[PDB]
Amino acid sequence: GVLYVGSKTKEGVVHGVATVAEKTKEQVTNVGGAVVTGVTAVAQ
Amino acid sequence: GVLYVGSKTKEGVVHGVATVAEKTKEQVTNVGGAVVTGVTAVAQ
Amino acid sequence: GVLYVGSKTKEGVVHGVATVAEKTKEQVTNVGGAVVTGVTAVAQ
Amino acid sequence: GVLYVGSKTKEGVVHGVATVAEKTKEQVTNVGGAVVTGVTAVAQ
Amino acid sequence: GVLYVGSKTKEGVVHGVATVAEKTKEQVTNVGGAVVTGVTAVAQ
Amino acid sequence: GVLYVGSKTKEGVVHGVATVAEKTKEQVTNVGGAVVTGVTAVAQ
Amino acid sequence: GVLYVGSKTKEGVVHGVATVAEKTKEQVTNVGGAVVTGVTAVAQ
Amino acid sequence: GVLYVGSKTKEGVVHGVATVAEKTKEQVTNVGGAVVTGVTAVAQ
Protein backbone atom coordinates (compact mmCIF):
# COMPACT_ATOMS: atom_id res chain seq x y z
CA GLY A 1 0.00 0.00 0.00
CA VAL A 2 2.04 2.88 -1.36
CA LEU A 3 -0.67 5.36 -2.37
CA TYR A 4 -0.07 9.06 -3.22
CA VAL A 5 -3.56 10.45 -3.55
CA GLY A 6 -4.86 13.74 -2.15
CA SER A 7 -3.45 15.90 -4.95
CA LYS A 8 -4.21 19.27 -6.55
CA THR A 9 -7.71 20.74 -6.52
CA LYS A 10 -7.58 24.58 -6.93
CA GLU A 11 -11.06 24.51 -5.35
CA GLY A 12 -12.97 22.63 -2.76
CA VAL A 13 -15.75 22.25 -0.20
CA VAL A 14 -15.65 18.89 1.60
CA HIS A 15 -18.37 17.74 4.00
CA GLY A 16 -17.61 14.17 5.10
CA VAL A 17 -20.62 13.13 7.20
CA ALA A 18 -23.40 15.43 8.37
CA THR A 19 -26.22 14.20 10.57
CA VAL A 20 -29.17 16.57 10.68
CA ALA A 21 -32.32 15.41 12.43
CA GLU A 22 -35.37 17.50 13.28
CA LYS A 23 -38.58 16.74 15.22
CA THR A 24 -37.63 13.07 15.20
CA LYS A 25 -36.83 10.27 17.58
CA GLU A 26 -33.50 8.71 16.77
CA GLN A 27 -30.40 8.40 14.61
CA VAL A 28 -27.42 6.07 14.79
CA THR A 29 -24.60 6.41 12.31
CA ASN A 30 -21.43 4.35 12.27
CA VAL A 31 -19.57 5.77 9.28
CA GLY A 32 -16.04 4.64 8.69
CA GLY A 33 -13.89 5.08 5.60
CA ALA A 34 -12.95 7.52 2.88
CA VAL A 35 -10.01 5.91 1.04
CA VAL A 36 -8.58 2.51 1.97
CA THR A 37 -5.96 0.17 0.61
CA GLY A 38 -5.55 -2.80 2.91
CA VAL A 39 -8.45 -2.86 5.37
CA THR A 40 -9.06 -6.14 7.20
CA ALA A 41 -11.74 -4.78 9.54
CA VAL A 42 -13.49 -7.20 11.91
CA ALA A 43 -17.02 -6.40 13.08
CA GLN A 44 -17.71 -2.73 12.34
CA GLY B 1 3.53 0.81 3.83
CA VAL B 2 4.04 4.42 2.81
CA LEU B 3 1.54 7.24 2.37
CA TYR B 4 1.63 10.64 0.64
CA VAL B 5 -1.58 12.47 1.40
CA GLY B 6 -2.88 16.03 1.48
CA SER B 7 -0.98 17.69 -1.38
CA LYS B 8 -1.46 21.12 -3.06
CA THR B 9 -4.91 22.66 -2.82
CA LYS B 10 -4.83 26.48 -3.42
CA GLU B 11 -8.12 26.69 -1.40
CA GLY B 12 -10.27 24.29 0.58
CA VAL B 13 -13.06 23.93 3.12
CA VAL B 14 -13.87 20.81 5.12
CA HIS B 15 -16.72 20.54 7.61
CA GLY B 16 -15.45 17.08 8.57
CA VAL B 17 -18.17 15.56 10.74
CA ALA B 18 -21.10 17.61 11.97
CA THR B 19 -24.26 17.00 14.00
CA VAL B 20 -27.37 19.15 14.33
CA ALA B 21 -30.76 18.48 15.83
CA GLU B 22 -33.97 20.23 16.84
CA LYS B 23 -36.74 18.92 19.18
CA THR B 24 -35.36 15.40 18.85
CA LYS B 25 -35.06 12.58 21.33
CA GLU B 26 -31.87 10.72 20.49
CA GLN B 27 -28.71 10.89 18.39
CA VAL B 28 -25.57 8.75 18.35
CA THR B 29 -22.54 8.98 16.09
CA ASN B 30 -19.67 6.48 16.13
CA VAL B 31 -17.50 7.83 13.31
CA GLY B 32 -14.13 6.20 12.81
CA GLY B 33 -13.36 7.24 9.25
CA ALA B 34 -11.07 9.24 7.00
CA VAL B 35 -8.24 8.28 4.63
CA VAL B 36 -6.83 5.02 6.04
CA THR B 37 -4.38 2.57 4.62
CA GLY B 38 -4.49 -0.66 6.60
CA VAL B 39 -6.89 -1.04 9.50
CA THR B 40 -6.96 -4.36 11.28
CA ALA B 41 -9.68 -3.15 13.69
CA VAL B 42 -11.86 -5.22 16.00
CA ALA B 43 -15.34 -3.92 16.88
CA GLN B 44 -15.42 -0.29 15.69
CA GLY C 1 6.24 3.99 7.05
CA VAL C 2 7.94 6.82 5.18
CA LEU C 3 4.58 8.64 5.54
CA TYR C 4 4.08 12.30 4.55
CA VAL C 5 0.84 13.85 5.71
CA GLY C 6 0.10 17.52 5.20
CA SER C 7 1.37 19.67 2.35
CA LYS C 8 0.82 23.12 0.87
CA THR C 9 -2.72 24.43 0.80
CA LYS C 10 -2.42 28.19 0.15
CA GLU C 11 -5.71 28.72 2.04
CA GLY C 12 -7.96 26.56 4.19
CA VAL C 13 -10.63 26.38 6.83
CA VAL C 14 -11.84 23.37 8.81
CA HIS C 15 -14.63 23.05 11.35
CA GLY C 16 -13.77 19.48 12.36
CA VAL C 17 -16.41 18.20 14.80
CA ALA C 18 -19.32 20.60 15.24
CA THR C 19 -22.30 19.58 17.35
CA VAL C 20 -25.46 21.66 17.74
CA ALA C 21 -28.72 20.82 19.45
CA GLU C 22 -31.93 22.63 20.29
CA LYS C 23 -34.52 21.36 22.82
CA THR C 24 -33.22 17.79 22.52
CA LYS C 25 -33.26 15.06 25.07
CA GLU C 26 -29.89 13.56 24.24
CA GLN C 27 -26.93 13.78 21.91
CA VAL C 28 -23.90 11.49 22.04
CA THR C 29 -21.08 12.15 19.60
CA ASN C 30 -18.20 9.68 19.77
CA VAL C 31 -15.80 10.54 16.92
CA GLY C 32 -12.65 8.46 16.66
CA GLY C 33 -11.15 9.28 13.28
CA ALA C 34 -8.91 11.22 10.92
CA VAL C 35 -6.20 10.19 8.47
CA VAL C 36 -4.91 6.91 9.96
CA THR C 37 -2.46 4.26 8.76
CA GLY C 38 -2.81 1.48 11.26
CA VAL C 39 -5.64 1.01 13.74
CA THR C 40 -5.75 -2.32 15.50
CA ALA C 41 -8.38 -0.95 17.87
CA VAL C 42 -10.52 -2.95 20.23
CA ALA C 43 -13.99 -1.56 20.90
CA GLN C 44 -14.27 2.12 20.03
CA GLY D 1 8.60 5.01 10.84
CA VAL D 2 10.04 8.18 9.37
CA LEU D 3 6.61 9.73 9.45
CA TYR D 4 7.49 13.25 8.32
CA VAL D 5 4.11 14.83 9.08
CA GLY D 6 3.03 18.44 8.68
CA SER D 7 3.87 21.26 6.28
CA LYS D 8 3.37 24.97 5.67
CA THR D 9 -0.03 26.10 4.49
CA LYS D 10 0.39 29.86 3.82
CA GLU D 11 -2.99 30.53 5.48
CA GLY D 12 -5.42 28.52 7.60
CA VAL D 13 -8.01 28.48 10.38
CA VAL D 14 -9.46 25.55 12.36
CA HIS D 15 -12.40 25.07 14.74
CA GLY D 16 -11.69 21.50 15.86
CA VAL D 17 -14.47 20.45 18.23
CA ALA D 18 -17.39 22.74 19.05
CA THR D 19 -20.71 22.31 20.87
CA VAL D 20 -23.85 24.45 21.31
CA ALA D 21 -27.00 23.63 23.28
CA GLU D 22 -30.27 25.58 23.38
CA LYS D 23 -33.09 25.02 25.91
CA THR D 24 -32.31 21.30 25.95
CA LYS D 25 -32.17 18.59 28.51
CA GLU D 26 -28.37 18.15 28.08
CA GLN D 27 -25.87 16.65 25.67
CA VAL D 28 -22.89 14.31 25.96
CA THR D 29 -19.78 14.16 23.80
CA ASN D 30 -17.18 11.41 24.14
CA VAL D 31 -14.96 12.52 21.25
CA GLY D 32 -11.35 11.60 20.82
CA GLY D 33 -9.38 11.47 17.59
CA ALA D 34 -7.24 13.31 15.03
CA VAL D 35 -4.40 12.83 12.53
CA VAL D 36 -2.58 9.71 13.70
CA THR D 37 -0.76 6.64 12.38
CA GLY D 38 -0.53 3.58 14.63
CA VAL D 39 -3.29 3.27 17.22
CA THR D 40 -3.52 -0.01 19.09
CA ALA D 41 -6.21 1.45 21.35
CA VAL D 42 -8.39 -0.56 23.71
CA ALA D 43 -11.87 0.69 24.67
CA GLN D 44 -12.78 4.34 24.14
CA GLY E 1 -24.14 57.85 -18.80
CA VAL E 2 -24.57 55.16 -16.16
CA LEU E 3 -22.47 51.98 -16.33
CA TYR E 4 -21.92 48.83 -14.30
CA VAL E 5 -19.08 46.94 -15.95
CA GLY E 6 -16.35 44.65 -14.62
CA SER E 7 -18.79 42.47 -12.67
CA LYS E 8 -18.24 38.93 -11.35
CA THR E 9 -15.81 36.81 -13.30
CA LYS E 10 -14.56 34.18 -10.80
CA GLU E 11 -11.33 33.80 -12.88
CA GLY E 12 -9.99 35.65 -15.88
CA VAL E 13 -6.93 36.41 -17.98
CA VAL E 14 -7.31 39.70 -19.87
CA HIS E 15 -4.76 40.75 -22.49
CA GLY E 16 -5.93 44.03 -24.06
CA VAL E 17 -3.38 44.57 -26.84
CA ALA E 18 -0.26 42.44 -27.16
CA THR E 19 1.58 44.04 -30.06
CA VAL E 20 4.27 41.54 -31.00
CA ALA E 21 6.71 41.94 -33.87
CA GLU E 22 9.27 39.32 -34.89
CA LYS E 23 11.66 39.87 -37.85
CA THR E 24 9.55 42.73 -39.20
CA LYS E 25 10.32 46.24 -40.34
CA GLU E 26 7.41 48.27 -38.96
CA GLN E 27 4.33 48.33 -36.72
CA VAL E 28 1.87 51.07 -35.72
CA THR E 29 -1.03 50.62 -33.31
CA ASN E 30 -3.61 53.13 -32.12
CA VAL E 31 -6.08 51.14 -30.00
CA GLY E 32 -8.73 53.40 -28.53
CA GLY E 33 -11.48 51.02 -27.49
CA ALA E 34 -13.37 49.44 -24.61
CA VAL E 35 -16.85 49.85 -23.09
CA VAL E 36 -17.95 53.39 -24.02
CA THR E 37 -21.06 55.55 -24.02
CA GLY E 38 -20.48 58.88 -25.68
CA VAL E 39 -17.31 59.02 -27.80
CA THR E 40 -17.09 62.00 -30.15
CA ALA E 41 -13.48 61.37 -31.23
CA VAL E 42 -12.15 63.62 -34.01
CA ALA E 43 -9.34 61.18 -34.68
CA GLN E 44 -8.08 57.71 -33.81
CA GLY F 1 -22.02 59.89 -15.46
CA VAL F 2 -23.00 57.84 -12.44
CA LEU F 3 -20.58 55.04 -13.29
CA TYR F 4 -19.70 51.89 -11.35
CA VAL F 5 -16.71 49.84 -12.48
CA GLY F 6 -14.72 46.97 -11.07
CA SER F 7 -16.93 44.61 -9.08
CA LYS F 8 -15.98 41.14 -7.78
CA THR F 9 -13.49 39.11 -9.70
CA LYS F 10 -12.23 36.40 -7.28
CA GLU F 11 -9.09 36.10 -9.45
CA GLY F 12 -7.74 38.10 -12.34
CA VAL F 13 -4.79 38.76 -14.62
CA VAL F 14 -4.33 41.50 -17.17
CA HIS F 15 -1.45 42.21 -19.47
CA GLY F 16 -2.84 45.63 -20.39
CA VAL F 17 -0.64 46.54 -23.29
CA ALA F 18 2.52 44.59 -24.01
CA THR F 19 5.02 45.38 -26.73
CA VAL F 20 7.41 42.52 -27.36
CA ALA F 21 9.66 42.90 -30.37
CA GLU F 22 12.62 41.04 -31.79
CA LYS F 23 14.97 41.75 -34.72
CA THR F 24 12.54 44.41 -35.92
CA LYS F 25 13.40 47.82 -37.26
CA GLU F 26 10.50 49.91 -35.97
CA GLN F 27 7.51 50.11 -33.68
CA VAL F 28 4.99 52.75 -32.61
CA THR F 29 2.12 52.14 -30.19
CA ASN F 30 -0.41 54.84 -29.31
CA VAL F 31 -2.97 53.09 -27.10
CA GLY F 32 -5.60 55.39 -25.66
CA GLY F 33 -8.22 52.87 -24.66
CA ALA F 34 -9.99 51.50 -21.64
CA VAL F 35 -13.48 51.84 -20.21
CA VAL F 36 -14.68 55.39 -20.93
CA THR F 37 -18.03 57.12 -20.96
CA GLY F 38 -17.69 60.48 -22.70
CA VAL F 39 -14.59 61.23 -24.73
CA THR F 40 -14.26 64.26 -26.94
CA ALA F 41 -10.68 63.52 -28.05
CA VAL F 42 -9.01 65.54 -30.81
CA ALA F 43 -6.08 64.18 -32.80
CA GLN F 44 -4.96 61.04 -30.93
CA GLY G 1 -19.18 62.56 -12.63
CA VAL G 2 -19.22 59.86 -9.94
CA LEU G 3 -16.58 57.26 -10.74
CA TYR G 4 -16.96 54.21 -8.48
CA VAL G 5 -13.72 52.46 -9.34
CA GLY G 6 -12.51 49.08 -8.20
CA SER G 7 -14.72 47.38 -5.63
CA LYS G 8 -13.78 44.18 -3.81
CA THR G 9 -11.73 41.80 -5.91
CA LYS G 10 -10.45 39.08 -3.51
CA GLU G 11 -7.41 38.68 -5.82
CA GLY G 12 -5.91 40.26 -8.92
CA VAL G 13 -2.64 41.02 -10.70
CA VAL G 14 -1.86 43.69 -13.29
CA HIS G 15 1.16 43.77 -15.59
CA GLY G 16 0.07 47.26 -16.69
CA VAL G 17 2.12 48.41 -19.69
CA ALA G 18 5.23 46.46 -20.67
CA THR G 19 7.88 46.82 -23.36
CA VAL G 20 10.40 44.13 -24.26
CA ALA G 21 12.91 44.11 -27.09
CA GLU G 22 15.76 41.92 -28.29
CA LYS G 23 18.23 42.83 -31.10
CA THR G 24 15.68 45.39 -32.29
CA LYS G 25 16.29 48.89 -33.52
CA GLU G 26 13.37 50.88 -32.09
CA GLN G 27 10.32 50.74 -29.89
CA VAL G 28 8.22 53.82 -29.13
CA THR G 29 5.38 53.14 -26.70
CA ASN G 30 3.20 56.20 -26.18
CA VAL G 31 0.38 54.96 -23.93
CA GLY G 32 -2.07 57.27 -22.36
CA GLY G 33 -5.23 55.62 -21.10
CA ALA G 34 -7.23 53.79 -18.43
CA VAL G 35 -10.78 54.02 -17.04
CA VAL G 36 -12.23 57.43 -17.95
CA THR G 37 -15.33 59.57 -17.51
CA GLY G 38 -14.01 62.46 -19.54
CA VAL G 39 -11.02 63.02 -21.82
CA THR G 40 -10.90 66.02 -24.12
CA ALA G 41 -7.29 65.39 -25.16
CA VAL G 42 -5.81 67.61 -27.83
CA ALA G 43 -2.99 65.96 -29.78
CA GLN G 44 -1.79 62.95 -27.79
CA GLY H 1 -16.26 64.99 -9.54
CA VAL H 2 -16.00 62.16 -7.04
CA LEU H 3 -13.72 59.14 -7.45
CA TYR H 4 -13.33 56.16 -5.13
CA VAL H 5 -10.47 53.80 -5.96
CA GLY H 6 -8.80 50.66 -4.68
CA SER H 7 -11.16 48.67 -2.49
CA LYS H 8 -10.53 45.22 -0.99
CA THR H 9 -8.03 42.96 -2.74
CA LYS H 10 -6.84 40.20 -0.36
CA GLU H 11 -3.78 39.78 -2.62
CA GLY H 12 -2.29 41.61 -5.58
CA VAL H 13 0.78 42.63 -7.55
CA VAL H 14 1.27 45.55 -9.96
CA HIS H 15 4.00 46.03 -12.58
CA GLY H 16 3.09 49.39 -14.11
CA VAL H 17 5.72 50.26 -16.73
CA ALA H 18 8.46 47.69 -17.25
CA THR H 19 11.13 47.65 -19.98
CA VAL H 20 13.79 45.11 -21.01
CA ALA H 21 16.22 45.60 -23.91
CA GLU H 22 18.89 43.59 -25.75
CA LYS H 23 21.20 45.47 -28.15
CA THR H 24 18.57 48.07 -29.11
CA LYS H 25 19.02 51.51 -30.48
CA GLU H 26 16.32 53.28 -28.43
CA GLN H 27 13.06 52.82 -26.56
CA VAL H 28 11.48 56.26 -26.49
CA THR H 29 8.82 55.18 -24.05
CA ASN H 30 6.49 58.01 -23.24
CA VAL H 31 3.87 56.50 -20.97
CA GLY H 32 1.00 58.37 -19.37
CA GLY H 33 -2.32 57.11 -18.17
CA ALA H 34 -4.20 56.02 -15.03
CA VAL H 35 -7.79 55.82 -13.80
CA VAL H 36 -8.77 59.41 -14.47
CA THR H 37 -11.91 61.57 -14.38
CA GLY H 38 -11.37 64.65 -16.56
CA VAL H 39 -8.40 65.26 -18.82
CA THR H 40 -8.13 68.33 -21.00
CA ALA H 41 -4.53 67.59 -22.02
CA VAL H 42 -2.65 69.41 -24.76
CA ALA H 43 0.27 67.89 -26.71
CA GLN H 44 2.14 64.86 -25.38
Side-chain angles (χ1 to χ4, degrees), chain A, chain B, chain C, chain D, chain E, chain F residues 1 3-44, chain G, chain H:
Chain A
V2 290
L3 70 96
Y4 307 164
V5 291
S7 294
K8 342 190 183 185
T9 166
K10 183 178 179 180
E11 295 302 320
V13 178
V14 192
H15 259 264
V17 46
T19 301
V20 176
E22 171 194 333
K23 308 172 184 184
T24 45
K25 173 156 163 177
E26 196 165 358
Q27 207 294 324
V28 174
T29 163
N30 289 263
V31 161
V35 171
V36 303
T37 180
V39 167
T40 77
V42 173
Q44 204 265 331
Chain B
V2 309
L3 185 69
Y4 301 66
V5 284
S7 286
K8 338 189 173 181
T9 79
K10 183 178 179 180
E11 199 150 349
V13 174
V14 47
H15 276 178
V17 44
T19 299
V20 183
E22 181 182 347
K23 314 179 193 185
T24 172
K25 176 178 158 189
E26 176 81 27
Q27 275 91 357
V28 157
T29 291
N30 313 341
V31 158
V35 184
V36 320
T37 78
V39 179
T40 83
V42 180
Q44 205 144 335
Chain C
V2 197
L3 177 143
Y4 289 107
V5 305
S7 283
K8 46 199 83 66
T9 96
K10 183 178 179 180
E11 208 166 343
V13 311
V14 45
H15 275 189
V17 187
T19 307
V20 184
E22 193 174 339
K23 322 163 206 182
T24 175
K25 174 189 162 194
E26 178 138 352
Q27 313 200 315
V28 174
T29 301
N30 313 325
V31 182
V35 186
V36 308
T37 289
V39 179
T40 83
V42 183
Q44 197 274 349
Chain D
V2 173
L3 205 145
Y4 196 74
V5 311
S7 200
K8 262 166 301 166
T9 83
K10 183 178 179 180
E11 204 143 338
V13 313
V14 52
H15 269 201
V17 172
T19 298
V20 162
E22 277 277 339
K23 322 165 192 192
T24 78
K25 180 171 188 182
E26 260 281 306
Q27 317 151 321
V28 160
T29 307
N30 308 355
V31 49
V35 188
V36 73
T37 90
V39 189
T40 83
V42 193
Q44 205 259 351
Chain E
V2 188
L3 262 73
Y4 314 79
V5 76
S7 305
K8 336 201 190 185
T9 88
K10 183 178 179 180
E11 196 171 351
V13 180
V14 187
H15 261 270
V17 44
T19 299
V20 169
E22 208 289 311
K23 298 187 196 171
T24 84
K25 276 187 203 166
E26 210 153 348
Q27 215 290 331
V28 173
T29 314
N30 294 266
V31 161
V35 196
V36 308
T37 279
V39 186
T40 74
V42 195
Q44 175 187 2
Chain F
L3 176 149
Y4 295 66
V5 294
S7 197
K8 283 187 265 202
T9 178
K10 183 178 179 180
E11 208 162 343
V13 179
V14 315
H15 272 216
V17 45
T19 313
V20 185
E22 182 211 325
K23 292 179 178 181
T24 168
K25 285 197 203 308
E26 286 268 6
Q27 211 281 331
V28 162
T29 302
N30 307 332
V31 169
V35 185
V36 311
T37 89
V39 177
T40 84
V42 175
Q44 213 268 345
Chain G
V2 182
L3 195 77
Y4 266 68
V5 176
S7 165
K8 300 190 175 178
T9 79
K10 183 178 179 180
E11 204 160 348
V13 306
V14 282
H15 271 182
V17 319
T19 302
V20 191
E22 181 186 344
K23 319 177 192 177
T24 73
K25 275 188 202 173
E26 198 145 4
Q27 318 187 274
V28 180
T29 291
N30 309 329
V31 170
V35 193
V36 158
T37 195
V39 165
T40 83
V42 189
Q44 203 276 347
Chain H
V2 198
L3 195 162
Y4 309 75
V5 58
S7 279
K8 192 203 287 211
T9 67
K10 183 178 179 180
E11 212 152 338
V13 315
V14 178
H15 263 64
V17 191
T19 299
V20 171
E22 311 285 321
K23 297 172 288 296
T24 167
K25 272 188 188 176
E26 53 187 0
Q27 281 93 340
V28 177
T29 306
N30 310 331
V31 189
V35 188
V36 65
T37 287
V39 186
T40 79
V42 198
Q44 193 169 336

